[PDB]
Amino acid sequence: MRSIARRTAVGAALLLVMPVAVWISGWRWQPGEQSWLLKAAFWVTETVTQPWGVITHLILFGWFLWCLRFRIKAAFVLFAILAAAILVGQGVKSWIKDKVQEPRPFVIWLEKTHHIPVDEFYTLKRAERGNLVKEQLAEEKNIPQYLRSHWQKETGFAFPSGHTMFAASWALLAVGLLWPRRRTLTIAILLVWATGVMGSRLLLGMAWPRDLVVATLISWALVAVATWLAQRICGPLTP
Template sequence: MPAQARRILAGMLLLILLPVAVMLSNWHWQPNSYPAWLLPLFWLTETVTQPFGILTHCILCGWFLWHLRCRLKPAMLLLFLLGSAILAGQGIKSVIKERVQEPRPYVVWLEQQHQVSVEQFYNLPRRQRAALVDQQLSSMALPPWLRNHWEKETGFAFPSGHTMFAASWALLAIGLLWPRGHRTSVILITGWAVGVMASRLALGMHWPQDLLMATGISTAIALIACWLAQRWCSGLAVPPDQSET
């Protein structure tokens, strides 16, 4: 197996440690308390939530180009591959969500606590879902940012689009930046991705299996994108002494 593929698969194993640990611990999300560390996790989620996700994407594209310092044509091809990888993940996510139609944890909780039928909830248009969430939570002492986030994120859960976005970038960094010595950047991007994954669980937006599936899809996309980058972008050739590290 090529060294690049081994690195990406190792990165996948690192990313799935969190959801696997949550599943093994039998932890279940409950909106009973809002500790101080929940707000930083919310801001991590916001780095992926639109419209901030577009800014994050642009920053990471620029970061990759700055590190790799390739010529104009390879740089344009690399931008195309990075954008295509992220868009492909989001497209696959949308198709699976509509087919599986798994409710979010907070929606299941609303059904249990407020007699809001999950089936009826998802039969409503998105604007009416948001209005229903606002109505049901009006008497609860929820942080405004959490209430607003729930009102905005009323779609299905499986798989996690936020995780797919962040995990794809982390695995692309492992495949493209790590062998070229930019390991601090890889560690920072991977840590950010793990934080985004944790935020999706802590905010009641996803189940552990949502994160696992998203990471698996991201791994397949990253393997293909990095393989193409090595062949299409001549400026990305790995030095011989690093090709098998």
């Protein structure tokens, strides 16, 4: 267990760099940003937002099980563990957002520009908030249609970062399960991919580094258990 906590903590440290840096800078999101960088950021984000959220979890689990090389009986358990891992992560994210009631960077701008209180905006039904955001943004035209539609779709609170929990958890599961087999390429790729998603969430005016630094911390604490259980129940990572 001691190892799982250190291993994943090293990977957590590497992901934490990006939001800690974006935090210290005191960077504040602005609209109609670098068009080429926003399309690139959004597509990175598209690897994690549903339905592609399930596809990625599956593709990743498929590659994970393939590396770990478990039996049919163990494979089943490895899926149940990882599925639970990513599902507890998103379940934590919700029973926090609703309690902290933090607004999103696009919402603060959209409601400040339409001189509508952000607190009264969040008083509304998530359905009618999406109805409002579709109608208010249609007046902007400066914002691209891919992002404009993604905004209506999302709405809701910002603290902590859901995408950066899915993505951070998978890069952390890579250090927690594929580092004893020493599969560096996967660990490195998944770290960069998760970091890009964390980057993408700031770039599209959706989250604060506060959400990312806390979301990485939760993903770590959850993965450090999930990978421990996976070792005890499924079997050793190493033969």
